[PDB]
Ligand binder design. Structure first.
Ligand SMILES: Nc1nc2c(ncn2[C@@H]2O[C@H](COP(=O)(O)OP(=O)(O)OP(=O)(O)O)[C@@H](O)[C@H]2O)c(=O)[nH]1
Ligand SMILES: Nc1ncnc2c1ncn2[C@@H]1O[C@H](COP(=O)(O)OP(=O)(O)CP(=O)(O)O)[C@@H](O)[C@H]1O
Ligand SMILES: Nc1nc2c(ncn2[C@@H]2O[C@H](COP(=O)(O)OP(=O)(O)O)[C@@H](O)[C@H]2O)c(=O)[nH]1
Ligand SMILES: [Ca+2]
Ligand SMILES: [Ca+2]
Ligand SMILES: [Mg+2]
Ligand SMILES: [Mg+2]
Ligand SMILES: [Mg+2]
Lengths: 423, 338, 438, 54
C-alpha cells in the first residue's frame, strides 16, 4: 500500500482541493459521512492510496487543509463533503497573507508551518509505505504560493526520498485578483523548479477561455473554472487510484515523464468538454484530447515539441481502437514528438468512467511549448520590476530586491532550457 | 496521409519518385531519421534492414531487397551462377568467368585459358571488379589485378551499321513486394560511336560502351544518336531492315528468360513474403548481343539510373505498381510470370 | 537425478513463473494442492520430475522455485492463487516499494538491502538438493527489478554457486505492451552486467508473442495472461528434457554444449509451432513436415529477425506428440533443399533432435488448442543480433541527450556505467557480424 | 543425411542428423561497488540538506 498525503493551502488550493475530494469520493463510492456505498470492488482495491480507514469501516481522506485565514476553510467544513475531513487536519491562522508571497513564505507563514508539519508527520507515520505528497495551490496569492512553497521546502527536508507533486494554478490578467500576481508566481516557480518532481500547470487563462469559448459560459465564475480542474485532477490521478500497469505510482510517473530534472511542468488536457447525452467515439476522444482547445495551460503544443505524453482513457471501450487512434495521432503528427526519446507516448485505460460520462480522456504532456506560459509570466513580472512597482509590499516584510532579480533570472533560465531541447 | 523518408540524396530515380509522391497530396515526407514512416527510400550501403517492421501500426515498405547484392556484385554474381544448381555451371547466357584474388580460381582460370590457346581459339579476356584491362595474355591480366573477375571478352559482338560499332542493352526490371517481376517496356542501347577494332584492345573507347566513357574519350560522341542512346523503336526497325527480324524474337525472349532465371534463383533468399517488412527494388540488367543474335548477361545493377527521356514514365510506374499497391491512393511493364 | 532451482524476479518473471508451474502441474498430473496420484514413492524419490519438485512426508510435491519482487501485489496473487497450496511462505519474497523502472534503483539502492535475504532463501532450497545442477532465472529486460536486481543476483550466484550453470528466460521490451520509456536503458545495463554470469539465455520479444497472439489466436488486444500462456508453452518445451525421461538436454550443462560454442553468443533463437486458436472446433492437424517448415518462418519466432541473412552455429529440434524420427528426417531433407540455411564453416550442418511422445498440455479453457504434435526449434543464429541493434539504437538516441540519466545517477550509479555497458553491446554486435557475415 | 546417437525410451527418443560436416568478481569486489553507490547517494543527500539548511 503506497500512500499519498494530500495538502491544500490557501483559498484557491482549498476550493480546488475540496472539489477534488468531492469528485474522487463519489467515484470510489464514499459518501459525505465516510461510508462506502459502491457496487464494485474496483472502487476499494486502491482506496488506501488516498483514504485512511477508521473504526466502523469509515474512510477518511489523507488530506491536510492549510490557510492563514479561516474564511475559506470554514466554507469547506460547511461544504457538501466538509464532514468527511479529519478535524485535526484543519490547520489555519488568523492574520492572512494579503496576496503577498513574502508574508506566506517568510513572516505570517513561518509562524504556522510547524503545526502543519506536525499533522503531516502524524499522517506519514501511519503510512505502510508513503510514496509522496500532492499539493494543491495557486501561485498568484500569498498562502498557497508563499507558504505552499515553504511547506514544500520543509517537507523535502524531512522526506528527501519521497516524491513531491503539485497542482499549481498559474495567474492570468484575464482572471486576476491583484497586480502583484506575477511577482508571487515568479518567486514560486523557482521553488517548484527545485523542490517538485511533477507539477501540473493549470492556467487560469486557459480555464477561462475554455469556459467562455467552448462551454459557452458568458460570465465564468471560479466555480466554473474549478469544475474543469476537478475533472482534470480526477483524470490525471486515475492511474494512481485504480488497478493498472502504466504510471501506477508517483515515482514511475516521474521516470516516464521527466527526462531532465528541471523540465517537470506538465500540460493537462481533458475531453470531452461539452456545453451532453451523445456518446463520444474513441477517435473523437483522441482528437479532442490532443486539441489545444482542451489544454489547461494556454500554450500551443504546435509551438513546441512533446518530450513525453501520458494518455488515460476511462470507460468501457475497445482497447484495440484506443491503440489504433493513439498510433494514428503520433504517426500523423510525428514531427511534434522529439525523435531522441523513442516511444515517448504511453496510454492507459480504466474501466470506471467519471460521473456523468460514458467515456473520457485525460491528457498529460511534457511539451517544450510550456515555455510560453513562463514567458508570459516573465514579461508581466519585468513590466513592473523594471520600475520596482509594488515592491514595497515585499521589502516591508524583509525581502531584498536581489531575491527578485534571482527569481527572474532563474525563470528565464527555465525558458532557455525548454528552448534548447525544442531545437 | 502516408509518410516516407529519403536517405539517398544521390538517387535520381527516387528523387523523381519523391517528387511524384508529394505531388499526389496524399504523401508526407519526414526527416531522414524519423522512424514513423510507411516507405523508406533507403541508402545504398548498410541499410538498417534490422530496424524495419518494428513500428506498431505502420505498414513499412523499403525500396531495396536485403541480400540482392549477391546478384548485383560481379564477384558475387560469378559465384552465384557457378554454385547455384538452378543456374548449374553450364548456363549458355553468361560468359565464362572466374573470380581471382590479388575461394580463389586462379589455377582454374589458367586451365581453360590453355585449352583454347592450344586449340587456336581466341584468348581475349577482360578483367574488372566492383578501370579494366583487355588482353590476350593471361600473365598481363593477373599482373593488372596485383578482388577481380576475369570473364571471356566477347570477340564477335553484333555491330550496328553504319559505324561498325559496339553496343550494350540496358533493361530496367521492377520487383514488387509480392515478387512480381516487371520488365520496363522501354529499354536503351548504349552504343559506341567509334568503329570496333579487334586489333588494338588498348584503345578502349570503341570497346567500352559506357555512357560516361563515350562522352569523355570519344570524338564521335552523339554522331548517330543523341547521347549514344538508341531506343527500342529504332533498334527494332534496324533489325527489321538489316536482319529481317524483330527485337522481340531475336533478343527480347532471351532477355526475359535471363531476368526470370536470375531473380527466381535468389527468390527464396530475399523474398519478403512472410516478413515483418516488405521490399521492392528497381534493377538494371546489362546485356551483350553477339553476331549470332545470342544475348549474354554482363552484370546487374542494384542502384541504376534511368535514361533522361524515360525518368517520367518509369518513375510513375514505380509509384503505381510498387508503392500504391501497398499504400493505395484516393501498363508500361511486362509481367514476367513464374 | 540432479535438481534445478527456478528464480522469478519482477512482475514479468513472477507472472510467467506462475503460468509455467501451472503447466508443469498439468503435465505431471500434480493437483493444485500438491498431491500427485501417479507418484507411488511417497515423501521422496529421484525421478525426472523430482528435478523441479521436492516431496514432503504428506505427499506434497513442492516446486523448487523462489519468487522475488520488490512489490507485494504481484506475488500476493500467487499466495492467493489456485496453486497457493504448492508454495510455502519461505518461497515468496516481497518488498515495500519497487525499483520504479530504474535499473540503478533495483540493482544498487534496493538490491543491497534485500540480496542477502534472497540468497538465504535460495540457500534453503540448495540445502535440499543432493546434486544441484543450477538455476533458471525468469525476468524482464525493462523493469527496474527484473533488470537491476537480476543482474545483482546473477553476480552473487556466480560467487556462491561457482560450479553451477545458470539459464535465463528474458523478456525483451516491446512498446506495444511496455510500461516505461527507459526500458532500453535497463535492457542494456542488465545485459552488460549479466553477460559473463549467464551460460545460456532465451530472449522472448513481447512484440513477437504479441503478434503471434493477434495473428494465430485471433486475440484483438492480447493481455499478459494471453502472452504468458504462450510463453509458458515455449518454456515448457525447453525444460521438458529436464523433467522427463530422455537423452537430449538432460542437464543444464548440455544446453551450453549443444547451443553455445562461443560463450558470449549464448542467446539461442526460439521458434514454436503450431499455435492454433481454440475457438475453432476442428482444425486440420499439421504434419511433421508442416510444423517443421514453420520453424523457419520468422512469424513464428520468439524474436522477429531474418535467419536467412545470418549463420547458424547449432540447431536443436524439440518435438512433443506423435512424431517418429523417420518423419523428422524426411521433413528436414525437403526443407533443406527449399530453405536458405547456412552454418558457420567451423560447425557441422546438422540438427540435434529430441522427441517426447506426450503431446503438449494446454490450460483448460485457455486460448491454445490441443494439437497432436508440436515442435520448438532452438537455433543459435547470428540474426538475433538484429534485436541488439534495435535496442542499441534506441539507447543511443536517448543517451546522446542524457535523457533520464539523472534518475540513475540519483541512485548512486555513475554516468560512466552507461557508456561502459554500451561499449560492451557494441563489441557484442561486432562479434555477431564477424561470426555470420563475410 | 547421417543419423547418429539414436536413443529410445518409453516416452520418446532422440538423435542427431548431420547434413554436412564442418569446413568472476569476488564477494568483496561486489560489496565495494554496492557501498560505493550507497556513499554517492549519501553525499548527494548531504549536499541537499546543506542546501536546505542555507
Ligand atoms: N510477457 C510478459 N511481459 C511482462 C509481464 N509483466 C511485465 N512485462 C514486461 O516487463 C517490462 C516491465 O518490467 P516489469 O517486470 O513489469 O517490472 P519489474 O521487474 O517488476 O520491476 P519494477 O520496476 O520494480 O516494477 C515491460 O516491458 C512489460 O511489457 C508479463 O506478465 N508477461
Ligand atoms: N565479357 C565481355 N565481352 C564484351 N564486352 C564486355 C564484356 N564485359 C564488359 N564489356 C564491356 O564493358 C562495358 C562496361 O563493363 P561493366 O558493366 O562490367 O562495368 P560497369 O559496372 O562500370 C558499367 P554498368 O554499372 O552500367 O554495368 C560494357 O558496356 C561492355 O561493353
Ligand atoms: N481556478 C481557481 N483559481 C483561483 C481560485 N481562487 C483564487 N484563484 C486564483 O489564485 C490567485 C489568488 O490566490 P489565492 O488562492 O486567492 O491566495 P491565497 O489564499 O493567499 O493562497 C489568483 O490568480 C486567482 O485567479 C479558485 O477557486 N479557482
Ligand atoms: Ca516420489
Ligand atoms: Ca559462472
Ligand atoms: Mg483570494
Ligand atoms: Mg556496376
Ligand atoms: Mg514491478
Amino acid at each position: 500500500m503506497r500512500e499519498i498525503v494530500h495538502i491544500q493551502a490557501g483559498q484557491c488550493g482549498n476550493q480546488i482541493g475540496a472539489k477534488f475530494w468531492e469528485v474522487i469520493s463519489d467515484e470510489h463510492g464514499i459518501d459525505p459521512t465516510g461510508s462506502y456505498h459502491g457496487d464494485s470492488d474496483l472502487q476499494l482495491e486502491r482506496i488506501n492510496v488516498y483514504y485512511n480507514e477508521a473504526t466502523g469501516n469509515k474512510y477518511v481522506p489523507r488530506a491536510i487543509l492549510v490557510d492563514l485565514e479561516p474564511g475559506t476553510m470554514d466554507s469547506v467544513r460547511s461544504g457538501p463533503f466538509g464532514q468527511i475531513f479529519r478535524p485535526d487536519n484543519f490547520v489555519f491562522g488568523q492574520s492572512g497573507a494579503g496576496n503577498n508571497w513574502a508574508k506566506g513564505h517568510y513572516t505570517e507563514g513561518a509562524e504556522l508551518v510547524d503545526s502543519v508539519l506536525d499533522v503531516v508527520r502524524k499522517e506519514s507515520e501511519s503510512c505502510d509505505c508513503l510514496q509522496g505528497f500532492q499539493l494543491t495551490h495557486s501561485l498568484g496569492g500569498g498562502t498557497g504560493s508563499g507558504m505552499g512553497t515553504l511547506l514544500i521546502s520543509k517537507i523535502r527536508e524531512e522526506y528527501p526520498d519521497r516524491i513531491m507533486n503539485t497542482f499549481s494554478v498559474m495567474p492570468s490578467p484575464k482572471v486576476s485578483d491583484t497586480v502583484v500576481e506575477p511577482y508571487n508566481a515568479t518567486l514560486s516557480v523557482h521553488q517548484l523548479v527545485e523542490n517538485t518532481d511533477e507539477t501540473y500547470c493549470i492556467d487560469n487563462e486557459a480555464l477561462y477561455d475554455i469556459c467562455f469559448r467552448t462551454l459557452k459560459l458568458t460570465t465564468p465564475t471560479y466555480g466554473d473554472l474549478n469544475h474543469l480542474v476537478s475533472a482534470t485532477m480526477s483524470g490525471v490521478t486515475t492511474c494512481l487510484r485504480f488497478p493498472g500497469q502504466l504510471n501506477a505510482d508517483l515515482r514511475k510517473l516521474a521516470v516516464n515523464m521527466v527526462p531532465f530534472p528541471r523540465l517537470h511542468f506538465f500540460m493537462p488536457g481533458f475531453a470531452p468538454l461539452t456545453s451532453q447525452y451523445r456518446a463520444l467515439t474513441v477517435p473523437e476522444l483522441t482528437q479532442q484530447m490532443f486539441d489545444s482547445k482542451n489544454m489547461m495551460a494556454a500554450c500551443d503544443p504546435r509551438h513546441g515539441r512533446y518530450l513525453t505524453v501520458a494518455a488515460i482513457f476511462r470507460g468501457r471501450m475497445s482497447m484495440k481502437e484506443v491503440d489504433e487512434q493513439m498510433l494514428n495521432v503520433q504517426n500523423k503528427n510525428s514531427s511534434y514528438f522529439v525523435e531522441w526519446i523513442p516511444n515517448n507516448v504511453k496510454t492507459a485505460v480504466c474501466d470506471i468512467p467519471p460521473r456523468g460520462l460514458k467515456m473520457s480522456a485525460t491528457f498529460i504532456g511534457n511539451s517544450t511549448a510550456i515555455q510560453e506560459l513562463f514567458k508570459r509570466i516573465s514579461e508581466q513580472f519585468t513590466a513592473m520590476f523594471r520600475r520596482k512597482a509594488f515592491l514595497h509590499w515585499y521589502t516591508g516584510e524583509g525581502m531584498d530586491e536581489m531575491e527578485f532579480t534571482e527569481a527572474e533570472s532563474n525563470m528565464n533560465d527555465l525558458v532557455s532550457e525548454y528552448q534548447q531541447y525544442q531545437d | 496521409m502516408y509518410t516516407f523518408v529519403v536517405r539517398d540524396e544521390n538517387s535520381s530515380v527516387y528523387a523523381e519518385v519523391s517528387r511524384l509522391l508529394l505531388a499526389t497530396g496524399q504523401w508526407k515526407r519526414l526527416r531522414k531519421d524519423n522512424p514513423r514512416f510507411n516507405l523508406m527510400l533507403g541508402e545504398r550501403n548498410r541499410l538498417p534492414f534490422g530496424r524495419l517492421g518494428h513500428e506498431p501500426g505502420l505498414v513499412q515498405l523499403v525500396n531495396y531487397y536485403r541480400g540482392a547484392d549477391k546478384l548485383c556484385r560481379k564477384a558475387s554474381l560469378v559465384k552465384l551462377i557457378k554454385t547455384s544448381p538452378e543456374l548449374s555451371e553450364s548456363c549458355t547466357w553468361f560468359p565464362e568467368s572466374y573470380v581471382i584474388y590479388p575461394t580463389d580460381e586462379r589455377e582454374v582460370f589458367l586451365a581453360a585459358y590453355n585449352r583454347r590457346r592450344e586449340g587456336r581459339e581466341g584468348n581475349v579476356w577482360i578483367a574488372k571488379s566492383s578501370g579494366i584491362l583487355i588482353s590476350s595474355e593471361a600473365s598481363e591480366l593477373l599482373d593488372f589485378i596485383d578482388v577481380h573477375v576475369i570473364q571471356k571478352y566477347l570477340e564477335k559482338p553484333l555491330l550496328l551499321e553504319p559505324g561498325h560499332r559496339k553496343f550494350d542493352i540496358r533493361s530496367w526490371v521492377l520487383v514488387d513486394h509480392l515478387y512480381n517481376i516487371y520488365l520496363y517496356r522501354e529499354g536503351v542501347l548504349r552504343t559506341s560511336s567509334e568503329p570496333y577494332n579487334s586489333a588494338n584492345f588498348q584503345d578502349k573507347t570503341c570497346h567500352l560502351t559506357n555512357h560516361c566513357i563515350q562522352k569523355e574519350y570519344s570524338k564521335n560522341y552523339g554522331r548517330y544518336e543523341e547521347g549514344n542512346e538508341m531506343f527500342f523503336e529504332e533498334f527494332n526497325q534496324y533489325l527489321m531492315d538489316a536482319l529481317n527480324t524483330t527485337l522481340e524474337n531475336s533478343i527480347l525472349l532471351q532477355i526475359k528468360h535471363i531476368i526470370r532465371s536470375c531473380l527466381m534463383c535468389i527468390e527464396p533468399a530475399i523474398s519478403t513474403k512472410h516478413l515483418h517488412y516488405q521490399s521492392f527494388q528497381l534493377f538494371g540488367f546489362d546485356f551483350m548481343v553477339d553476331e549470332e543474335l545470342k544475348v549474354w548477361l554482363i552484370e546487374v545493377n542494384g542502384a541504376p539510373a534511368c535514361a533522361q527521356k524515360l525518368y517520367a514514365e518509369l518513375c510513375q510506374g514505380i509509384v503505381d505498381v510498387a508503392i500504391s499497391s501497398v499504400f493505395p491512393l484516393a501498363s508500361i511493364f511486362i509481367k514476367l510470370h513464374h | 537425478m540432479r535438481e534445478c532451482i527456478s528464480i522469478h524476479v519482477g512482475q514479468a518473471g513472477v507472472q510467467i513463473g506462475n503460468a509455467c508451474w501451472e503447466l508443469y502441474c498439468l503435465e505431471h498430473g500434480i493437483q493444485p494442492d500438491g498431491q500427485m496420484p501417479s507418484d507411488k514413492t511417497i515423501g521422496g524419490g529421484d525421478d525426472s520430475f523430482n528435478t523441479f519438485f521436492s516431496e514432503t512426508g504428506a505427499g506434497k510435491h513442492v516446486p523448487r522455485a523462489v519468487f522475488v519482487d520488490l512489490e507485494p501485489t504481484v506475488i500476493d496473487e500467487v499466495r492467493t492463487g489456485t496453486y497457493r497450496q504448492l508454495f510455502h511462505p519461505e518461497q515468496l519474497i516481497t518488498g515495500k516499494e519497487d525499483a520504479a523502472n530504474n535499473y540503478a534503483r533495483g540493482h544498487y539502492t534496493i538490491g543491497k538491502e534485500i540480496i542477502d535475504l534472497v540468497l538465504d532463501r535460495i540457500r534453503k532450497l540448495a540445502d535440499q538438493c543432493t546434486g544441484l545442477q543450477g538455476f533458471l532465472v525468469f525476468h524482464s529486460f525493462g523493469g527496474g527489478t527484473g533488470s537491476g536486481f537480476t543482474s545483482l543476483l546473477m553476480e552473487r550466484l556466480s560467487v556462491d554457486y561457482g560450479k553451477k550453470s545458470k539459464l535465463e528466460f528474458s523478456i525483451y521490451p516491446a512498446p506495444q505492451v511496455s510500461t516505461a520509456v527507459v526500458e532500453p536503458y535497463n535492457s542494456i545495463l542488465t545485459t552488460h552486467t549479466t553477460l559473463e554470469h549467464s551460460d545460456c539465455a532465451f530472449m522472448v520479444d513481447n512484440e513477437a508473442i504479441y503478434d503471434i497472439c493477434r495473428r494465430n489466436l485471433d486475440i484483438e488486444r492480447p493481455t499478459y495472461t494471453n502472452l504468458n500462456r504462450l510463453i509458458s508453452q515455449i518454456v515448457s518445451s525447453i525444460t521438458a528434457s529436464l523433467r522427463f525421461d530422455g537423452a537430449l538436454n538432460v542437464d543444464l550443462t548440455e544446453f551450453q554444449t549443444n547451443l553455445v560454442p562461443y560463450p558470449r553468443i549464448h542467446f539461442p533463437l526460439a521458434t514454436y509451432a503450431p499455435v492454433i486458436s481454440a475457438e475453432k472446433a476442428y482444425h486440420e492437424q499439421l504434419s511433421v513436415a508442416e510444423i517443421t517448415n514453420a520453424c523457419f518462418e520468422p512469424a513464428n519466432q520468439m524474436v522477429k529477425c531474418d535467419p536467412r541473412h545470418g549463420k547458424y552455429m547449432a540447431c536443436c529440434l524439440l518435438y512433443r506428440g506423435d512424431v517418429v524420427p523417420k518423419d523428422v528426417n524426411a521433413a528436414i531433407a525437403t526443407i533443406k533443399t527449399k530453405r536458405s540455411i547456412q552454418f558457420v564453416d567451423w560447425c557441422p550442418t546438422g540438427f540435434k533432435v529430441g522427441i517426447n511422445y506426450q503431446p503438449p498440455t494446454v490450460v483448460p479453457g485457455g486460448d491454445l488448442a490441443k494439437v497432436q504434435r508440436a515442435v520448438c526449434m532452438l537455433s543459435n543464429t547470428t540474426a538475433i543480433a538484429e534485436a541488439w541493434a534495435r535496442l542499441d539504437h534506441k539507447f543511443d538516441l536517448m543517451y546522446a541527450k542524457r535523457a533520464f540519466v539523472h534518475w540513475y545517477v540519483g541512485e548512486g550509479m555513475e554516468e560512466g556505467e552507461f557508456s561502459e555497458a554500451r561499449e560492451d553491446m557494441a563489441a557484442l554486435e561486432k562479434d555477431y557480424e564477424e561470426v555470420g557475415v563475410d | 543425411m547421417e543419423v547418429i546417437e539414436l536413443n529410445k525410451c518409453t516416452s520418446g527418443q532422440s538423435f542427431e542428423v548431420i547434413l554436412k560436416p564442418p569446413s568472476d568478481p569476488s564477494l568483496e569486489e561486489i560489496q565495494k561497488k554496492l557501498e560505493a553507490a550507497e556513499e554517492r547517494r549519501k553525499y548527494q543527500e548531504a549536499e541537499l540538506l546543506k542546501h536546505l539548511a542555507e
